[PDB]
Short mmCIF file of C-alpha atoms and ligand atoms in Angstrom, two decimals:
data_model
loop_
_atom_site.label_atom_id
_atom_site.label_comp_id
_atom_site.label_asym_id
_atom_site.label_seq_id
_atom_site.Cartn_x
_atom_site.Cartn_y
_atom_site.Cartn_z
CA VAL A 1 -0.28 -0.07 0.10
CA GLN A 2 1.09 3.12 -1.46
CA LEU A 3 -0.60 6.98 -0.51
CA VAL A 4 0.68 9.85 -2.80
CA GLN A 5 -0.88 13.02 -1.79
CA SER A 6 -1.52 16.17 -3.33
CA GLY A 7 1.28 18.93 -3.96
CA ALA A 8 1.83 21.58 -2.13
CA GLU A 9 -1.17 24.52 -2.11
CA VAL A 10 -1.29 28.53 -1.47
CA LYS A 11 -4.98 29.48 -0.67
CA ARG A 12 -6.41 32.74 0.18
CA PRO A 13 -8.65 33.48 4.20
CA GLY A 14 -11.29 32.18 3.61
CA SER A 15 -11.38 29.82 0.82
CA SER A 16 -11.20 26.00 0.66
CA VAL A 17 -8.96 24.05 -0.16
CA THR A 18 -9.19 19.97 -2.13
CA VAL A 19 -6.33 17.64 -1.20
CA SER A 20 -6.22 14.32 -2.55
CA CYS A 21 -4.88 10.88 -1.61
CA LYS A 22 -3.82 7.83 -4.45
CA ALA A 23 -3.54 4.79 -3.21
CA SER A 24 -1.74 2.17 -4.94
CA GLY A 25 -1.29 -1.05 -3.50
CA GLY A 26 -4.20 -3.88 -1.47
CA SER A 27 -7.45 -3.28 -1.55
CA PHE A 28 -9.50 0.53 -1.23
CA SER A 29 -12.84 -0.09 -1.06
CA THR A 30 -12.88 -1.84 2.37
CA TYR A 31 -10.67 -0.22 4.37
CA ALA A 32 -10.98 3.74 6.72
CA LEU A 33 -8.85 6.32 5.46
CA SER A 34 -8.17 8.83 7.57
CA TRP A 35 -7.11 12.72 7.33
CA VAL A 36 -4.71 14.44 9.76
CA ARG A 37 -2.86 17.34 9.94
CA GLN A 38 0.37 18.82 11.56
CA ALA A 39 0.40 22.73 12.16
CA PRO A 40 4.39 23.80 12.65
CA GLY A 41 6.15 22.58 15.78
CA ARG A 42 2.85 21.29 17.15
CA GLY A 43 1.33 17.38 17.55
CA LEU A 44 -0.64 15.71 15.11
CA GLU A 45 -4.64 15.84 15.21
CA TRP A 46 -7.29 13.15 13.80
CA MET A 47 -10.03 15.41 10.91
CA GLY A 48 -11.86 12.64 10.29
CA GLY A 49 -11.80 9.95 8.25
CA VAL A 50 -14.77 7.88 5.05
CA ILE A 51 -15.38 4.43 4.44
CA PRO A 52 -15.75 4.10 0.89
CA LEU A 53 -17.59 1.28 -0.02
CA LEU A 54 -20.15 1.89 2.56
CA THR A 55 -20.10 6.09 1.90
CA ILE A 56 -19.39 6.49 6.01
CA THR A 57 -17.23 9.75 7.12
CA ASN A 58 -17.30 10.35 10.58
CA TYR A 59 -15.46 14.31 11.25
CA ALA A 60 -13.74 15.43 14.46
CA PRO A 61 -17.25 18.16 16.24
CA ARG A 62 -13.95 20.65 15.42
CA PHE A 63 -14.38 20.16 12.41
CA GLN A 64 -17.94 19.31 11.63
CA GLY A 65 -19.36 21.86 9.21
CA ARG A 66 -16.24 23.24 7.41
CA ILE A 67 -14.88 19.74 6.48
CA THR A 68 -15.95 16.39 3.57
CA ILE A 69 -14.08 14.07 2.62
CA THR A 70 -14.77 11.80 0.21
CA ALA A 71 -13.91 9.13 -1.58
CA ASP A 72 -13.79 7.52 -6.07
CA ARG A 73 -13.37 3.76 -6.04
CA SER A 74 -12.28 4.11 -9.84
CA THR A 75 -9.82 5.87 -9.10
CA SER A 76 -8.45 4.69 -5.59
CA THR A 77 -7.81 8.43 -4.46
CA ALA A 78 -9.61 9.83 -1.64
CA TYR A 79 -10.43 13.99 -1.36
CA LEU A 80 -10.50 15.73 1.99
CA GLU A 81 -12.04 19.31 1.18
CA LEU A 82 -11.79 21.79 4.42
CA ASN A 83 -13.68 25.17 3.86
CA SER A 84 -13.39 28.95 5.31
CA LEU A 85 -9.60 29.04 5.91
CA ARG A 86 -7.90 31.01 8.59
CA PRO A 87 -3.63 31.43 9.40
CA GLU A 88 -4.79 28.18 11.68
CA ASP A 89 -5.32 26.06 9.03
CA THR A 90 -0.92 26.40 8.09
CA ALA A 91 -0.26 22.85 8.40
CA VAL A 92 0.83 19.23 6.57
CA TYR A 93 -2.26 17.30 6.21
CA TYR A 94 -1.22 14.23 5.31
CA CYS A 95 -3.78 11.27 4.79
CA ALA A 96 -3.81 8.15 6.54
CA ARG A 97 -4.88 4.79 6.06
CA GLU A 98 -5.74 1.53 8.55
CA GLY A 99 -3.08 -0.87 8.71
CA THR A 100 -4.05 -4.80 8.96
CA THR A 101 -2.75 -7.91 10.57
CA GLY A 102 -1.95 -11.83 9.13
CA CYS A 103 -2.31 -12.25 5.45
CA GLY A 104 -6.00 -12.50 5.07
CA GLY A 105 -5.86 -8.79 5.06
CA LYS A 106 -8.17 -8.06 8.65
CA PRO A 107 -8.11 -4.52 9.10
CA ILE A 108 -6.51 -3.00 12.41
CA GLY A 109 -7.93 0.61 12.91
CA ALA A 110 -4.45 2.35 13.83
CA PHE A 111 -3.02 4.26 10.59
CA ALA A 112 -0.05 1.77 9.27
CA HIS A 113 -0.16 3.79 5.91
CA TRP A 114 0.92 7.74 5.80
CA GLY A 115 0.54 9.99 2.65
CA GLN A 116 3.70 12.14 2.53
CA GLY A 117 1.83 14.83 3.75
CA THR A 118 0.43 18.03 1.71
CA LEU A 119 1.41 21.66 2.93
CA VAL A 120 -0.98 23.69 2.77
CA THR A 121 0.14 27.87 3.68
CA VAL A 122 -3.29 29.67 4.29
CA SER A 123 -1.66 33.72 3.28
CA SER A 124 -2.02 36.70 1.08
CA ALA A 125 1.13 37.47 -0.05
CA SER A 126 2.26 36.64 -3.36
CA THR A 127 5.45 34.33 -4.82
CA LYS A 128 8.41 36.87 -3.58
CA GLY A 129 12.13 35.64 -4.16
CA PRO A 130 14.61 36.96 -1.41
CA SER A 131 17.92 39.21 -0.24
CA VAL A 132 20.69 37.58 0.23
CA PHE A 133 22.86 39.25 2.45
CA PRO A 134 25.93 38.71 4.11
CA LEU A 135 26.51 37.71 7.65
CA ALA A 136 30.58 38.88 7.68
CA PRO A 137 33.33 36.83 10.16
CA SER A 138 34.36 39.03 12.86
CA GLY A 145 40.29 30.20 16.75
CA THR A 146 36.67 29.66 15.77
CA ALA A 147 34.97 32.53 13.39
CA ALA A 148 31.13 32.39 12.58
CA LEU A 149 29.55 33.70 8.95
CA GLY A 150 26.90 33.14 7.44
CA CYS A 151 23.74 35.06 5.24
CA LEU A 152 20.49 35.83 5.80
CA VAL A 153 18.38 35.16 3.14
CA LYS A 154 15.32 37.72 4.01
CA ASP A 155 11.04 37.91 2.14
CA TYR A 156 10.98 35.06 0.34
CA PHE A 157 6.90 33.41 -0.04
CA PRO A 158 6.03 30.58 -0.29
CA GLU A 159 8.61 28.12 1.63
CA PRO A 160 11.06 26.49 1.22
CA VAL A 161 14.09 27.17 0.52
CA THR A 162 17.05 25.59 0.92
CA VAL A 163 20.93 26.12 1.81
CA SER A 164 23.92 24.46 1.08
CA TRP A 165 27.79 25.69 1.32
CA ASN A 166 30.51 25.53 -0.99
CA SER A 167 28.35 23.04 -3.09
CA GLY A 168 27.54 21.12 -0.05
CA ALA A 169 31.51 20.27 -0.13
CA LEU A 170 30.72 22.20 3.85
CA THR A 171 28.75 20.39 6.35
CA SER A 172 30.71 20.14 9.27
CA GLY A 173 29.94 22.85 11.50
CA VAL A 174 27.13 24.08 9.18
CA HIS A 175 23.26 25.21 10.77
CA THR A 176 20.56 26.01 8.72
CA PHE A 177 17.84 27.92 11.33
CA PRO A 178 13.96 26.77 10.62
CA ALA A 179 12.39 30.17 8.65
CA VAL A 180 9.93 32.62 10.76
CA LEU A 181 7.21 34.15 9.51
CA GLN A 182 7.54 37.99 10.01
CA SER A 183 4.58 40.28 10.20
CA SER A 184 4.63 41.39 6.45
CA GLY A 185 3.61 37.68 5.92
CA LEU A 186 7.10 37.12 3.89
CA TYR A 187 9.66 34.09 5.90
CA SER A 188 12.99 34.94 6.69
CA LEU A 189 15.98 32.09 7.06
CA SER A 190 19.60 32.34 8.14
CA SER A 191 22.44 29.81 7.29
CA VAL A 192 25.49 29.56 9.75
CA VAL A 193 28.88 27.76 9.57
CA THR A 194 31.73 27.91 12.00
CA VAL A 195 35.51 27.68 10.87
CA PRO A 196 38.94 28.53 11.63
CA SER A 197 40.02 31.97 11.91
CA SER A 198 42.67 31.45 10.37
CA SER A 199 41.27 29.60 7.37
CA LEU A 200 39.25 33.32 6.66
CA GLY A 201 42.75 34.17 4.56
CA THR A 202 42.80 30.73 2.98
CA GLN A 203 38.80 28.68 2.19
CA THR A 204 36.66 30.75 0.12
CA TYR A 205 32.96 30.34 1.67
CA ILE A 206 29.81 30.41 -0.49
CA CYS A 207 26.05 30.06 0.60
CA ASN A 208 24.22 28.31 -2.45
CA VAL A 209 20.19 29.62 -1.84
CA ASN A 210 18.08 28.00 -4.29
CA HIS A 211 14.03 29.32 -3.44
CA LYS A 212 12.64 27.55 -6.72
CA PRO A 213 8.75 29.06 -6.61
CA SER A 214 10.69 32.85 -7.25
CA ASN A 215 13.80 30.63 -9.26
CA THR A 216 16.32 32.95 -7.11
CA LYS A 217 19.35 30.40 -7.57
CA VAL A 218 22.38 33.12 -6.00
CA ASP A 219 25.70 31.40 -4.86
CA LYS A 220 26.35 34.56 -2.48
CA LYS A 221 30.43 34.52 -1.42
CA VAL A 222 30.90 35.28 2.62
CA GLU A 223 33.61 37.31 3.05
CA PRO A 224 35.36 39.43 5.93
CA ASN B 1 -17.19 3.20 17.16
CA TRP B 2 -16.56 4.06 13.88
CA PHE B 3 -12.74 2.08 13.97
CA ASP B 4 -14.27 -1.33 13.92
CA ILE B 5 -17.21 -1.14 11.10
CA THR B 6 -14.38 -2.60 8.84
CA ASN B 7 -13.22 -5.27 10.53
CA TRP B 8 -16.82 -5.96 10.44
CA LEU B 9 -17.18 -5.59 6.48
CA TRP B 10 -14.24 -7.98 6.32
CA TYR B 11 -15.16 -10.72 8.82
CA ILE B 12 -19.22 -10.74 6.82
CA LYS B 13 -17.08 -10.78 3.41
CA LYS B 14 -14.73 -13.58 3.85
CA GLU C 1 -13.78 14.01 24.18
CA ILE C 2 -11.61 11.41 25.68
CA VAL C 3 -7.89 14.13 26.26
CA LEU C 4 -4.65 12.08 26.68
CA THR C 5 -2.06 12.91 28.31
CA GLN C 6 1.63 12.03 27.96
CA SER C 7 4.05 13.10 30.36
CA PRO C 8 6.90 14.33 30.61
CA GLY C 9 6.33 16.01 27.14
CA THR C 10 10.72 15.97 26.44
CA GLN C 11 12.78 12.79 27.85
CA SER C 12 16.21 13.56 27.83
CA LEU C 13 18.25 10.12 28.18
CA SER C 14 21.05 8.66 27.25
CA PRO C 15 21.76 5.54 24.15
CA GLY C 16 21.41 2.15 25.19
CA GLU C 17 19.28 3.33 28.12
CA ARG C 18 15.46 1.56 28.44
CA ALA C 19 12.79 4.61 28.16
CA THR C 20 9.36 4.54 29.62
CA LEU C 21 6.48 6.81 28.15
CA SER C 22 3.23 7.46 30.04
CA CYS C 23 0.31 7.93 28.03
CA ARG C 24 -3.27 9.04 30.80
CA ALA C 25 -6.69 8.82 29.13
CA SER C 26 -9.07 10.64 30.89
CA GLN C 27 -11.53 8.34 30.41
CA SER C 28 -11.79 4.70 30.03
CA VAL C 29 -10.16 4.01 26.09
CA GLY C 30 -12.98 1.42 23.89
CA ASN C 31 -10.81 -2.33 23.71
CA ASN C 32 -7.52 -0.60 24.54
CA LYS C 33 -7.43 1.03 20.94
CA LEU C 34 -3.96 2.40 22.25
CA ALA C 35 -1.76 2.60 19.51
CA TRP C 36 2.46 5.25 19.70
CA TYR C 37 3.49 6.21 15.79
CA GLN C 38 7.13 7.83 16.01
CA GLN C 39 7.49 11.08 14.04
CA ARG C 40 11.34 12.19 12.89
CA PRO C 41 11.61 16.01 11.83
CA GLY C 42 10.24 16.16 8.24
CA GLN C 43 9.18 13.19 7.87
CA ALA C 44 5.74 11.30 8.18
CA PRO C 45 4.72 9.79 11.45
CA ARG C 46 4.83 5.74 11.36
CA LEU C 47 3.43 2.88 13.53
CA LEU C 48 5.09 1.24 16.70
CA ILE C 49 1.78 -0.52 18.24
CA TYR C 50 -1.49 -0.63 18.07
CA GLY C 51 -4.19 -2.61 20.38
CA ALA C 52 -2.10 -1.03 23.55
CA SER C 53 0.77 -3.95 22.46
CA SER C 54 0.51 -5.60 19.55
CA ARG C 55 3.51 -4.54 17.39
CA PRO C 56 3.37 -4.97 13.44
CA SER C 57 5.63 -7.36 11.68
CA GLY C 58 8.75 -5.12 10.50
CA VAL C 59 8.62 -2.77 13.58
CA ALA C 60 11.44 -3.75 16.19
CA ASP C 61 11.16 -5.91 18.78
CA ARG C 62 12.68 -3.46 21.28
CA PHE C 63 9.55 -1.52 21.25
CA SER C 64 6.68 -3.00 23.10
CA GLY C 65 3.11 -1.55 24.41
CA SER C 66 1.58 -1.91 27.92
CA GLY C 67 -1.63 -0.78 29.83
CA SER C 68 -5.31 -0.87 29.71
CA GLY C 69 -8.71 1.21 30.59
CA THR C 70 -6.99 5.26 31.36
CA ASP C 71 -2.91 3.89 32.06
CA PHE C 72 -1.24 2.89 29.29
CA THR C 73 2.72 2.79 28.17
CA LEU C 74 4.96 2.80 25.49
CA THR C 75 8.79 0.64 26.18
CA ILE C 76 12.11 0.94 24.72
CA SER C 77 14.20 -1.56 25.83
CA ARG C 78 17.33 0.09 24.76
CA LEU C 79 17.82 3.03 23.33
CA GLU C 80 19.50 3.12 19.55
CA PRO C 81 20.18 6.67 17.98
CA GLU C 82 17.46 6.45 15.04
CA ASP C 83 15.15 5.90 18.32
CA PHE C 84 15.75 10.04 19.39
CA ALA C 85 12.09 11.06 17.85
CA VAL C 86 8.77 12.06 18.82
CA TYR C 87 6.18 9.54 20.34
CA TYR C 88 2.31 9.99 20.11
CA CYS C 89 0.02 8.06 21.10
CA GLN C 90 -3.69 8.05 19.67
CA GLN C 91 -7.02 6.54 20.93
CA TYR C 92 -9.30 4.89 18.41
CA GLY C 93 -11.98 3.26 21.13
CA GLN C 94 -15.00 5.59 20.08
CA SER C 95 -15.81 7.17 16.48
CA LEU C 96 -13.76 10.28 17.51
CA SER C 97 -9.58 9.41 17.43
CA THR C 98 -7.50 12.27 19.60
CA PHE C 99 -3.73 12.56 20.18
CA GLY C 100 -1.37 12.89 23.01
CA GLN C 101 0.96 16.31 22.16
CA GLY C 102 3.58 13.93 22.01
CA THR C 103 6.89 13.34 24.12
CA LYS C 104 10.25 14.41 22.24
CA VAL C 105 13.64 11.25 23.83
CA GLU C 106 16.16 13.61 23.27
CA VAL C 107 20.01 13.07 23.62
CA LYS C 108 20.91 13.64 27.75
CA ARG C 109 25.10 15.34 27.15
CA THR C 110 26.60 17.70 29.21
CA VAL C 111 26.12 20.94 30.05
CA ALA C 112 27.23 23.78 27.46
CA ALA C 113 27.39 27.01 26.51
CA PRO C 114 25.92 28.44 23.97
CA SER C 115 28.92 30.32 22.02
CA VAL C 116 27.61 34.06 21.01
CA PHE C 117 28.12 35.75 17.77
CA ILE C 118 26.25 39.25 16.60
CA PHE C 119 26.16 40.58 13.14
CA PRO C 120 25.89 44.18 12.57
CA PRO C 121 23.49 44.38 8.89
CA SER C 122 25.05 44.44 5.75
CA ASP C 123 26.46 47.60 3.96
CA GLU C 124 24.25 45.79 0.95
CA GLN C 125 21.47 45.13 3.10
CA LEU C 126 21.36 49.52 3.94
CA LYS C 127 21.45 51.04 0.38
CA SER C 128 17.42 48.96 0.46
CA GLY C 129 16.51 50.89 3.72
CA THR C 130 16.18 48.18 6.29
CA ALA C 131 18.56 47.44 8.84
CA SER C 132 18.79 43.26 10.21
CA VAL C 133 21.04 42.80 13.45
CA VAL C 134 21.87 38.59 13.89
CA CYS C 135 22.35 37.07 17.40
CA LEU C 136 23.90 33.02 16.58
CA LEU C 137 23.77 31.13 19.94
CA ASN C 138 25.38 28.49 19.03
CA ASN C 139 26.11 25.02 20.24
CA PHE C 140 24.71 24.84 22.84
CA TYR C 141 22.87 22.34 25.47
CA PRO C 142 20.62 22.11 27.10
CA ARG C 143 17.83 23.40 24.81
CA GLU C 144 16.45 25.93 27.30
CA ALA C 145 18.20 29.37 26.51
CA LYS C 146 17.04 33.04 26.16
CA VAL C 147 17.91 35.96 24.08
CA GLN C 148 17.08 40.41 25.07
CA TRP C 149 18.12 42.41 22.03
CA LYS C 150 19.31 45.83 23.97
CA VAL C 151 19.70 49.13 21.84
CA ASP C 152 21.44 51.75 23.57
CA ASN C 153 20.71 49.73 26.65
CA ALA C 154 16.61 50.06 25.98
CA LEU C 155 15.24 46.56 25.42
CA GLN C 156 13.20 46.03 22.84
CA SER C 157 10.15 43.92 22.18
CA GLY C 158 7.95 43.14 19.38
CA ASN C 159 11.04 43.51 16.35
CA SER C 160 12.91 39.86 16.84
CA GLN C 161 11.98 36.80 15.77
CA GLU C 162 14.58 33.53 16.89
CA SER C 163 14.44 29.95 16.13
CA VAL C 164 16.24 26.77 16.73
CA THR C 165 18.02 23.86 15.02
CA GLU C 166 17.20 20.79 15.45
CA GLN C 167 19.56 18.27 18.12
CA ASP C 168 22.38 18.34 16.10
CA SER C 169 23.09 14.53 15.39
CA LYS C 170 26.88 14.01 16.21
CA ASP C 171 27.63 16.58 19.17
CA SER C 172 23.97 16.81 20.40
CA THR C 173 23.69 20.77 21.05
CA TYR C 174 21.13 22.85 19.71
CA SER C 175 21.77 26.51 18.46
CA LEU C 176 19.45 29.76 17.99
CA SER C 177 19.59 32.58 15.94
CA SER C 178 17.97 35.45 16.81
CA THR C 179 16.95 38.68 13.61
CA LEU C 180 16.98 42.06 15.06
CA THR C 181 14.30 44.48 12.14
CA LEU C 182 14.36 48.32 11.49
CA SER C 183 14.44 50.73 9.72
CA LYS C 184 17.39 52.31 8.20
CA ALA C 185 16.19 55.75 9.65
CA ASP C 186 15.77 53.88 12.92
CA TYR C 187 18.72 52.26 12.90
CA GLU C 188 20.55 55.29 12.63
CA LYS C 189 19.38 57.18 15.26
CA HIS C 190 20.97 54.23 17.53
CA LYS C 191 24.62 53.70 19.00
CA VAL C 192 25.41 50.30 21.16
CA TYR C 193 23.40 47.12 19.27
CA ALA C 194 23.30 43.92 21.92
CA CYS C 195 22.28 41.10 22.52
CA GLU C 196 22.21 39.79 25.86
CA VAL C 197 22.06 35.73 26.35
CA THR C 198 21.29 33.67 29.51
CA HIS C 199 21.66 29.85 29.32
CA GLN C 200 22.23 27.23 32.55
CA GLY C 201 25.83 27.14 30.88
CA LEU C 202 26.74 30.53 32.38
CA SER C 203 26.93 31.67 35.76
CA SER C 204 25.76 34.91 34.36
CA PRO C 205 24.16 36.30 31.32
CA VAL C 206 27.14 36.92 27.94
CA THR C 207 26.89 40.11 26.54
CA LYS C 208 27.90 41.02 22.49
CA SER C 209 27.85 44.44 20.88
CA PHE C 210 28.54 46.87 18.23
CA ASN C 211 29.00 50.59 18.15
CA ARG C 212 26.86 51.21 14.61
CL1 LIG D 1 11.66 0.21 13.94
N1 LIG D 2 -22.75 21.75 6.77
#
């Protein structure tokens, strides 16, 4: 059993989102499919589920009136619709199917099979590429790059095209009062290497096609 | 309990 | 609604040690329908235990579940490096399924004071009308740390944000980055930019500062 979800979505406040989950392997109609979400830095929350063959849904009271879960037996696809979106709905949405025990397909209720998750970002912001600024170094020196004011997630950062990993810390983004993100990436290195060695932060923001190789020098 | 329904469905479909 | 309490929320343990994680329910869980999941940063959750004590064939036999009614336990007989993660309990004994808030099992190591660095705004950013000052707190343990920004010795509020790395897989430390953001016009009104750091490893707060 493999569950494959639709890609990340940016949605305006008050809009509705549909997330899909296509199952391949095993049987689809006779096993319970649930949706679980996880807000950034927070816990798992069960939202609801469906049993396709019987068309029996079961929604958490918290979402009853805002959610619809449907199943299409012809495509082994389940759908989550969540309405009246608010910033608090920003989360990774996972589909989760119950497991089985033995070789007879007896269901276990608990979620053995998970999709890769779908990030839904609820925001009024427009796609924006970051500015990349050096954090210049003053036995051990610190230096880095500040990746400021981008949308949406994500940004990746390497050093020296992946050759430098020891001592690197790339921090989680913060969401600024503009609704744009900022992140920093730093590395500590020997003070003696600042004369000899070149340090380049490779920033990649695919949505804006911002690809900067920023040389950080004293 | 909704979480018990598929076990019943499995049992009756054998 | 059944409330599942996972206390403590964090356990700091050494590789090789035993771990016992508690899940207490506000009401009896129907037919001991209690599951445990592991979740590592950036990954989907993974089922370890279902029906309080049943283990799926693929799952390491160092994981075991026990308990019934309102009182459940996940036992890890000997922590391997990959076992340092977050563990969630879940009840599915009634139509409204709930999860616990999770317990993070993290690596215990010796107290390490942060190395503190302050970075003025780049000439490049200042050309643009904004000034970001960055404070790095590097390679500290435990995770609890406090950063206060001071500008000409005035404590700042509402103009900084911070974030923390996951525990380092090699040295079991954390790092923290904080950004103070001002307009260039406001940045040019002040001389002394300081970040003041508090941590268990420091007998008194450490200040790094520069004069604009
Ligand atoms: Cl395992
Ligand atoms: N409704």
